[PDB]
Curated annotation (Swiss-Prot), chain A:
Record's subunit section: Interacts transiently with the RNA polymerase catalytic core formed by RpoA, RpoB, RpoC and RpoZ (2 alpha, 1 beta, 1 beta' and 1 omega subunit) to form the RNA polymerase holoenzyme that can initiate transcription. Identified in a complex containing RpoD, the RNA polymerase subunits RpoA, RpoB and RpoZ, CRP and DNA. Interacts with Rsd; this prevents interaction with the RNA polymerase catalytic core and with promoter DNA, and as a consequence, promotes transcription from promoters that require alternative sigma factors. (Microbial infection) Interacts with Escherichia phage lambda antitermination protein Q.
Sites annotated Interaction with anti-sigma factors: 71
Function: Sigma factors are initiation factors that promote the attachment of RNA polymerase to specific initiation sites and are then released. This sigma factor is the primary sigma factor during exponential growth. Preferentially transcribes genes associated with fast growth, such as ribosomal operons, other protein-synthesis related genes, rRNA- and tRNA-encoding genes and prfB.
Ranges where the record places region Interaction with anti-sigma factors: 93-108
The record's note on its domains: Contains 4 domains, connected by flexible linkers. In the active conformation, the domains are in an extended conformation, each making extensive interactions with the RNA polymerase catalytic core.
Species this chain originates from: Escherichia coli (strain K12)
DNA-binding interval(s): 82-101
UniProtKB/Swiss-Prot annotation, chain C:
Entire protein: shown range: 896 to 945 of 1342
Assembly notes: The RNAP catalytic core consists of 2 alpha, 1 beta, 1 beta' and 1 omega subunit. When a sigma factor is associated with the core the holoenzyme is formed, which can initiate transcription. The rRNA transcription and antitermination complex (rrnTAC) consists of RNAP, NusA, NusB, NusE (rpsJ), NusG, SubB, ribosomal protein S4, DNA and precursor rRNA; S4 is more flexible than other subunits. In pull-down experiments interacts with CedA. (Microbial infection) Interacts (via flap domain) with Escherichia phage lambda antitermination protein Q; this interaction renders bacterial RNAP resistant to transcription pausing and allows it to read through termination signals.
Name under which the protein is recorded: DNA-directed RNA polymerase subunit beta
Signal peptide region: none
Taxonomic source organism: Escherichia coli (strain K12)
Function: DNA-dependent RNA polymerase (RNAP) catalyzes the transcription of DNA into RNA using the four ribonucleoside triphosphates as substrates.
Post-translational modification: Acetylated on several lysine residues in the presence of glucose.
Swiss-Prot record, chain D:
GO MF annotation list: DNA binding; DNA-directed RNA polymerase activity; magnesium ion binding; zinc ion binding
Result after altering residue 776 to R: Resistant to antibiotics salinamide A and B
Source species: Escherichia coli (strain K12)
The protein's name: DNA-directed RNA polymerase subunit beta'
Gene name for this UniProt entry: rpoC
Pfam family membership, one: RNA_pol_Rpb1_5
Curated annotation (Swiss-Prot), chain F:
Gene name of the record: rpoZ
Record's catalysed reaction(s): RNA(n) + a ribonucleoside 5'-triphosphate = RNA(n+1) + diphosphate
Biological-process GO terms, alphabetical: bacterial-type flagellum assembly; bacterial-type flagellum-dependent cell motility; cell motility; cellular response to cell envelope stress; DNA-templated transcription initiation; intracellular iron ion homeostasis; nitrate assimilation; protein-containing complex assembly
UniProt similarity note: Belongs to the RNA polymerase subunit omega family.
Any single Pfam family the record assigns to this protein: RNA_pol_Rpb6
GO cellular component, as recorded: cytosol; cytosolic DNA-directed RNA polymerase complex; RNA polymerase complex; transcription elongation factor complex
InterPro entries per the UniProt record, alphabetical: DNA-dir_RNA_pol_omega, Pol_omega/Rpo6/RPB6, RPB6/omega-like_sf
Annotated TM spans: none
EC number: 2.7.7.6
Assembly information from the UniProt record: The RNAP catalytic core consists of 2 alpha, 1 beta, 1 beta' and 1 omega subunit. When a sigma factor is associated with the core the holoenzyme is formed, which can initiate transcription. The rRNA transcription and antitermination complex (rrnTAC) consists of RNAP, NusA, NusB, NusE (rpsJ), NusG, SubB, ribosomal protein S4, DNA and precursor rRNA; S4 is more flexible than other subunits.
Record's protein name: DNA-directed RNA polymerase subunit omega
Function: Promotes RNA polymerase (RNAP) assembly. Latches the N- and C-terminal regions of the beta' subunit thereby facilitating its interaction with the beta and alpha subunits.
Protein's organism: Escherichia coli (strain K12)
């Protein structure tokens, strides 16, 4: 079955200058789109989703915002295991997991919910 | 055909239809002269920089358009920016002077 | 990303290991399907419809 | 203050040669291996053309090895595999280099045609190559022995020469020698030596070449380039992403050709490094060295030696020089075009309902075009929670968005453009009106300016985004602001065809018609009579009208009277605003008058009324034309009753002349002309026969027996009105059509006796084909020539812009009407309109200033000049404008689509070029090529000769092949003797005194003379009139202005004669020069000021010299432009148009003219 | 130009070796080398080094493949 | 709409310096720093600015004049804050 793999790599790259059609300056390379780019309708929504999560995280109690920003990478390097957070809060372990739930729960039922739901599809 | 924001050519960042959501209309030499006869520079600048060739300016514009601020923070057309490396890839030292 | 991770967390969607490549009708054009053909590489099991 | 070290906003640019250390400055790593990507993991192989270490991470913010994958880590160089984790964008920026083993020559400086290295060493090319291929030895720094410094030796000679002197004699071969030569070269000392020889020895052959070279050397000195640098030690490598390897579907790969090239230079280079440590024999390392040179040549500019071909693919691989050139002639991707977002296009249709300021735009195009704008308004009002949802809404086409689109559209112009953009009117701004359907609807009145028929022409649309583009669009590109052709002040919005048929059918009168003779209070009740069926549209009727005249001081007089008119003119009067007299509508209203209606309306009431007037004219035109029911049937084309008879008589004549030829009474050649003459004459007869019958034969009765007026026949109404058709085309319909011509150009003596109303038979049609086919062929080529001409034209002008206000020179040219041989082939009033007077002009008595010095002559003033009999006016011209680096507006004129005097900063050259070029399609020595000869200054073929100097002349010496002409000035010195071939029949009287510039023979004259001998005004007058002869003969209106500015650019250069500051024979700018002797007349030398001589450069030649090298690199040959600049270290300051577009900043004209001003002064400031 | 030509002609000068000439040169080769071997054989530091190196080989600080290619035999 | 801008070119002669000034003003309106000087009909800021030019209550002198005052209006508020930057000493 390696025939396929082997048979593939054997093919020599095509001159990107291959004239195609019309003999015109259309050259094979002129048609190769850029895929690492990011569509602006996307780049735009990122700047918005930040502002979104940033607003709704101010809508909670200060510890609910920190705990969620903690539990995820929000405006911070990495994210913290839930044990670390307990030590940071001096109130530890199972307790914290609960707060997370109510926070997600609090953003779930719409007053809060109408804006963040519009981000998916 | 109409296009707002489409795909882009890799080698030069330029509008390119890849989806058959068509690449923009081509603004050629003659059309440029036409803008030069009117005195409209900004129309012309926006045509060949942010509306097209500036990989930065293009997104920076869109974000302002939705924000409702019509401006352009143009930067340098990437086409020319490549010419610069191409000259410099030869033996030529080409620099951008002063301020 | 972080805020995306929170987004799935609130609305509880499992983000798939798979992306949608499906062929869909071009914008604005509308019609009736008069036919479907299925070509398969020799050796992959032909699916049900095919 | 701190100057700066980081990214502020640059001015100018510099270009120069590159040091090896300089090349190393850029390089982030040495590319040491041809490997590209791993072949299994498709990852880049380290130290290869694609390298993560040298250039950059493959994917954004991620280490190659993968140890550091986090966006947090940024200035981190991975400890595993060094990659500073940063956007992959940097793979597009960072360069690299290659340290070559044995020096290598740079193909550009070896082979651009005047080999720079060659003349820098003053050494021939073939010799240098002979040293490069190791085919011969060259001495270097020869010392005192036997041998010259640049002398070249052979093998034996080197050997023999070495036995005598071991040292104090030196020779190398190959690239190192040349590098050795260049490094050793002392330019300054060479300068001095060349200076001494200049003073000592006098010979034209000798000092010509001498002075030429010394400038280059000191130039190169002043450059800062060191000659060794023309020889490459280090070779920079272009960033990978600019010659990418990207994959394709099916797993195939595609890549730039440079890799194939680059790969080779490395291999060959590396093999050489090996071959040194193996101490291989010379024959080999030499061969390897040659191969290395070849590879670099193919990399840099391929095609100057062998043209290496790509792998497995015949087509030659493209080198960096071919990357810069691009193709389609000279186009650097600013010039051919650039794709642009926010745009679209589709087929266009009519839309008569539109006001002139708007256009029909399909709903969907408008949805997709404004998508980002819509998103912003949608969440501004909060109809969409967030941007994503907004997309989903419009993608869903929820009913609410359409209303939102009406908001964002309202005040927001769009640009509409058609395919061959010629004059600036090819792009005009409109206000969008949402339209169901996929077609663009376009205001009819504008269809003329675009040259857009409705046969399926497509137009493209562009959304101006930035606010300044909205305001530029509204105040510049809006339709209503350009209502007048820039080529000539006549309105370009004049109604076209249906509308003019309407108004003609409206105001026309038959002899007897319903309502004839009655009387009405005013137009209101005139329409009331018409709509009701009581009165005919055309019947002679008296009605009371009230016209107005503003002839008071800014004030409208009113007068009411009983005008004898028709019903139609009465009805139409409702539209004419204010000022205008009823006199304007009381006529038949043809297309010509109907335009000047608009014109006067504009020149009197101003802009706004002309627009709104214009809208009204169209609406009413279509409408009544719609009421008229004009049509065309087959019986509307009336053949003369006498046709067969005319043909028969002319048929006797040909048979008579044939009998005269049968009897030899007339020669064959004489016969051909003879038969053609009668046939030509016959056709004219039939034409003016059918014309008489067709035109007036409506013969009608009022209360009496008969009377006859001009026909109401459909097709005549069309041609008379000016709507469509012309006596010529009509003549082919009814009267016989023409005498065709056989392909070789003779014209057949049996014309086409039938016409289209009858049938053409087999033979006749077949003969028609040749003329037809040649027309299409001819037109398509005259199309191309026109385009070519406008190109050269904008190139020679372009950067010319109105800059100062009034240069304040009294200087100018004397304007007279063209008056050719008969009476007035074109008047004075048109020539002087809108120009500015050079000096106050007199009545026939004096101390009576009618128009006082420089005053814009507008319509009233021209009429006051017209009131009086004044026959001659001196007028300021751009050719005489004293301002340097531009034109003073006072010297230019008023012209614009607006009547006001030209604004400061409008770029006129372009509009000049465009104005001349657009009509060029309609032209056809004589023809368009005649125009080109003129603007190209070309000296005619069999020219005349003009008296070099005044005074009595005589013939001298004898027939050697030239019989010398000896001139004897009265006061002055005689010595002028010109060599005139005596086999050309002369004119000049052997015994008469001749003024310099008189006609010494006949035949055309080179404008060089006219400029040189007769002076500037003469040649400029000569140019305008000859080209204008061509256009006006073709029926084209082009103001002399435009032609005058092209001339100014033609004479841009001059050649010094005297001295006292700069060099003798230097050709140079009169702007530059005049500014230097105007600077020299004081301070400095009391006056050392040097005398010059104006020169005539053809456009294509004058366009060649431009200070900005980026501009020249555009349209000229790039390689030559870049090199010749790169040696001199030429520093482009921009300042021009072409160049600012390339780099992409504001044009130093128009809107930007304010900017450049603020920066240009900031520059050369502190 | 086109270096195949300037090469073909540069080597084309060299005359093919006679069957005897090959051996002559080859013999010459032997001499040159044989001189340096002997020239090498006469150096004292050259021996003690080899000695000091073999003491490192028996001491497990190197391998036999990294010192000799074999002797005569 | 503003069908023809002819009236504005009269208020400032050049017609190019006209485009700039109305732009500058339109941004004073589009980016919300200020509010209109004359009834807005749903005319977008593009035209609102043009109406303001025609009426002669907005040109480059006035704007430069207006702007120069705001510099001092803000220099008055922060007066204590920046003089508190005496820590430079
Ligand atoms: Mg057509
Ligand atoms: Zn790493
Ligand atoms: Zn002037």
């Amino acid at each position: 079955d390696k025939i396929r793999k082997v048979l593939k790599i054997a093919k020599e790259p095509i001159s990107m200058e291959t004239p195609i059609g019309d003999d015109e300056d259309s050259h094979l390379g002129d048609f190769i789109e850029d895929t690492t780019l990011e569509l602006p309708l996307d780049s735009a929504t990122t700047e918005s989703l930040r502002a979104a999560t940033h607003d709704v995280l101010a809508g909670l109690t200060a510890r609910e915002a920190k705990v969620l920003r903690m539990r995820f990478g929000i405006d911070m390097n990495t994210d913290y295991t839930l044990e670390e957070v307990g030590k940071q809060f001096d109130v530890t372990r199972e307790r914290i997991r609960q707060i997370e739930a109510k926070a997600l729960r609090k953003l779930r039922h719409p007053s809060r919910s109408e804006v963040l739901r519009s981000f998916l599809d | 055909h109409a296009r707002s924001t489409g795909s882009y050519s890799l080698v030069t960042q330029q509008p390119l239809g890849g989806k058959a959501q068509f690449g923009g209309q081509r603004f050629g030499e003659m059309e440029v002269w036409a803008l030069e006869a009117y005195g409209a520079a900004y129309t012309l600048q926006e045509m060949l920089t942010v509306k097209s060739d500036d990989v930065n300016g293009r997104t920076k514009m869109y974000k302002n358009i939705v924000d409702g601020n019509h401006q352009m923070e143009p930067g340098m057309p990437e086409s020319f920016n490549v010419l610069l490396k191409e000259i410099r890839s030869l033996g030529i030292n080409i620099e951008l002077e002063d301020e | 990303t972080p805020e995306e991770k929170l987004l799935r967390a609130i609305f509880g969607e499992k983000a798939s290991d798979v992306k949608d490549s499906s062929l869909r009708v071009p914008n604005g054009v509308s019609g009736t399907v008069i036919d479907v053909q299925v070509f398969t590489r020799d050796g992959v099991e032909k699916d049900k419809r095919a | 203050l701190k100057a700066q070290t980081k990214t502020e906003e640059f001015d100018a640019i510099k270009i120069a040669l590159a040091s090896p250390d300089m090349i190393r400055s850029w390089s982030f790593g040495e590319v040491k291996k041809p490997e590209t990507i791993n072949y299994r993991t498709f990852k880049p192989e380290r130290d290869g053309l694609f390298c993560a270490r040298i250039f950059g991470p493959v994917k954004d913010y991620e280490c190659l090895c993968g140890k550091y994958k986090r966006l947090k880590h940024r200035g981190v160089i991975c400890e595993k595999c060094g990659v500073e984790v940063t956007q992959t964008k940097v793979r597009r920026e960072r360069m690299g280099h290659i340290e070559l083993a044995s020096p290598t020559a740079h193909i550009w400086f070896l082979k651009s045609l005047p080999s720079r290295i060659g003349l820098l060493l003053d050494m021939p090319l073939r010799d240098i190559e002979r040293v490069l291929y190791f085919e011969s030895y060259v001495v270097i720094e020869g010392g005192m022995t036997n041998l010259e410094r640049q002398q070249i030796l052979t093998e034996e000679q080197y050997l023999d020469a070495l036995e005598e002197f071991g040292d104090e004699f030196d020779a190398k071969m190959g690239a190192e020698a040349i590098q050795a030569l260049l490094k050793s070269m002392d330019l300054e000392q060479e300068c001095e030596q060349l200076r001494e020889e200049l003073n000592e020895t006098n010979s034209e052959t000798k000092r010509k070449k001498l002075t030429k070279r010394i400038k280059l050397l000191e130039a190169f000195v002043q450059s800062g380039n060191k000659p060794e640098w023309m020889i490459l030690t280090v070779l920079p490598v272009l960033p990978p992403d600019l010659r990418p390897l990207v994959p394709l579907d099916g797993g195939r790969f595609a890549t730039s050709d440079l890799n194939d090239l680059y790969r080779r230079v490395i291999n060959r280079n590396n093999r050489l490094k090996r071959l040194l440590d193996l101490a291989a024999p010379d024959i080999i390392v030499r061969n390897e060295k040659r191969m290395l040179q070849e590879a670099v040549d193919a990399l840099l500019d391929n095609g100057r030696r062998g043209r290496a071909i790509t792998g497995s693919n015949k087509r030659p691989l493209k080198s960096l020089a071919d990357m810069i050139k691009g193709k389609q002639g000279r186009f650097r991707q600013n010039l051919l075009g650039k794709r642009v977002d926010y745009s679209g296009r589709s087929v266009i249709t009519v839309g008569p309902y539109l006001r002139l300021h708007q256009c029909g735009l399909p709903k969907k195009m408008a949805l997709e075009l404004f998508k980002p704008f819509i998103y912003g308004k949608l969440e501004l009002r909060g109809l969409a929670t967030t941007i994503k949802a907004a997309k989903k809404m419009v993608e869903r086409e929820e009913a609410v968005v359409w209303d939102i689109l009406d908001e964002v559209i309202r005040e927001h112009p769009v640009l509409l453009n058609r395919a061959p953009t010629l004059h600036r009117l090819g792009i005009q701004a409109f206000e969008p009106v949402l339209i169901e359907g996929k077609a663009i609807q376009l205001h009819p009145l504008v269809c003329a300016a675009y040259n857009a028929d409705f046969d399926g022409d497509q137009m493209a649309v562009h959304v101006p985004l930035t606010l300044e583009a909205q305001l530029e669009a509204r105040a510049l590109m809006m339709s209503t602001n350009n209502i007048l052709s820039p080529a000539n002040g006549e309105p370009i919005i004049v109604p076209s065809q249906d509308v003019v048929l309407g108004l003609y059918y409206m105001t026309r009168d038959c002899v007897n018609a319903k309502g004839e003779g009655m009387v009405l209070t005013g137009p209101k009740e005139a329409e009331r009579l018409y709509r009701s069926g009581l009165a005919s549209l055309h019947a002679r009727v008296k009605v009371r009208i009230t016209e107005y005249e503003k002839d008071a001081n800014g004030e409208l007089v009113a007068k009411t009277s009983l005008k004898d008119t028709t019903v139609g003119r009465a009805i139409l009067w409702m539209i004419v605003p204010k000022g205008l007299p009823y006199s304007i509508v009381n006529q038949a209203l043809g297309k010509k008058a109907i335009s000047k209606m608009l014109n006067t309306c504009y020149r009197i009431l101003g802009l706004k009324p002309t627009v709104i007037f214009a809208d009204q004219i169209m609406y009413t035109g279509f409408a009544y034309a719609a009421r008229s029911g004009a049509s065309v049937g087959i019986d509307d084309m009336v053949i003369p009753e006498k046709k067969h008879e005319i043909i028969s008589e002319a048929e006797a004549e040909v048979a008579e002349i044939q009998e005269q030829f049968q009897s030899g009474l007339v020669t064959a050649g004489e016969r051909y002309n003879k038969v053609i003459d009668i046939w030509a004459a016959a056709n004219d007869r039939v034409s003016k026969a059918m014309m008489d019958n067709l035109q007036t034969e409506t013969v009608i009765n009022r209360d009496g027996q008969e009377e006859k007026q001009v026909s109401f026949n459909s097709i005549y109404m069309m041609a008379d009105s000016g709507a469509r058709g012309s006596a010529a085309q009509i003549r082919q319909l009814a009267g016989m059509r023409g005498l065709m011509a056989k392909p070789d150009g003779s014209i057949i003596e049996t014309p086409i006796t039938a016409n289209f109303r009858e049938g053409l038979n087999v033979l006749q049609y077949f003969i028609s084909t040749h003329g037809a086919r040649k027309g299409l062929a001819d037109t398509a080529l005259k199309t191309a020539n026109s385009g070519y001409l406008t190109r050269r034209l904008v190139d020679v002008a372009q950067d010319l812009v109105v800059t100062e206000d009034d240069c304040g020179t009294h200087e100018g040219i004397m304007m007279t009407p063209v008056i050719e041989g008969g009476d007035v082939k074109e008047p004075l009033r048109d020539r002087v309109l809108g120009r500015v007077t050079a000096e106050d002009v007199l009545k026939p008595g004096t101390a009576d200033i009618l128009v006082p010095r420089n005053t814009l002559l507008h319509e009233q003033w021209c009429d006051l000049l017209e009131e009086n009999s004044v026959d001659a006016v001196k007028v300021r011209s751009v050719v005489s404008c004293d301002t340097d680096f531009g034109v003073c507006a006072h010297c230019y004129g008023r012209d614009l689509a607006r009547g006001h005097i030209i604004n400061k900063g409008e770029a006129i050259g372009v509009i000049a070029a465009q104005s001349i070029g657009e009509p060029g399609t309609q032209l056809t020595t004589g023809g368009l090529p005649r125009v080109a000869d003129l603007f190209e200054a070309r000296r005619p073929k069999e020219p005349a000769i003009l008296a070099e100097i005044s005074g009595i002349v005589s013939f001298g010496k004898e027939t050697k092949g030239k019989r010398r002409l000896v001139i004897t000035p009265v006061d002055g010195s005689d010595p002028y003797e010109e060599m005139i071939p005596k086999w050309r029949q002369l004119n000049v009287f052997e015994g008469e005194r001749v003024e310099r510039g008189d006609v010494i023979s006949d035949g055309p004259e080179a404008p060089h003379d006219i400029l040189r001998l007769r002076g500037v005004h003469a040649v400029t007058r000569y140019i305008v009139n000859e080209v204008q002869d061509v256009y006006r003969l073709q029926g084209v209106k082009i103001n002399d202005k435009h032609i005058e500015v092209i001339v100014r650019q033609m004479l841009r250069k001059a050649t010094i004669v005297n001295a006292g500051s700069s060099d003798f024979l230097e050709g140079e700018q009169v702007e530059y020069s005049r500014v230097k002797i105007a600077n020299r007349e004081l301070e400095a030398n009391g006056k050392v000021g040097a005398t010059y001589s104006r020169d005539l450069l053809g456009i294509t030649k004058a366009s060649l010299a431009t200070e900005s090298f980026i501009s020249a690199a555009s349209f000229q040959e790039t390689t030559r432009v870049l090199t010749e600049a790169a040696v001199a270290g030429k520093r482009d300051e921009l300042r021009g148009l072409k160049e600012n577009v390339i780099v992409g900043r504001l044009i130093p004209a128009g809107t930007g003219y304010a900017y450049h001003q603020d920066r240009m002064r900031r520059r050369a400031a502190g | 130009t086109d270096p195949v030509r300037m090469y073909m002609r540069e080597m084309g000068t060299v005359e093919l070796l006679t069957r005897e000439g090959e051996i002559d040169i080859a013999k010459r080769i032997e001499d040159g080398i044989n001189q340096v071997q002997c020239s090498v054989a006469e150096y004292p530091e050259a021996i003690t080094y080899l000695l000091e190196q073999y003491d490192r080989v028996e001491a497990e600080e190197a391998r036999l493949s990294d010192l000799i290619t074999g002797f005569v035999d | 709409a503003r069908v023809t801008v002819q009236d504005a070119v009269e208020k400032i002669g050049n017609r190019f310096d006209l485009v700039l000034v109305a732009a500058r003003r339109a941004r004073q309106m589009q980016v919300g720093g200020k509010d209109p000087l004359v009834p807005e009909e749903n005319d977008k800021t593009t035209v609102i600015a043009l109406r303001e030019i025609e009426e002669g209550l907005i040109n480059n002198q006035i704007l430069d004049v207006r702007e120069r005052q705001e510099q001092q209006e803000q220099e008055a508020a922060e007066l204590q804050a920046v003089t508190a930057i005496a820590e430079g000493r």
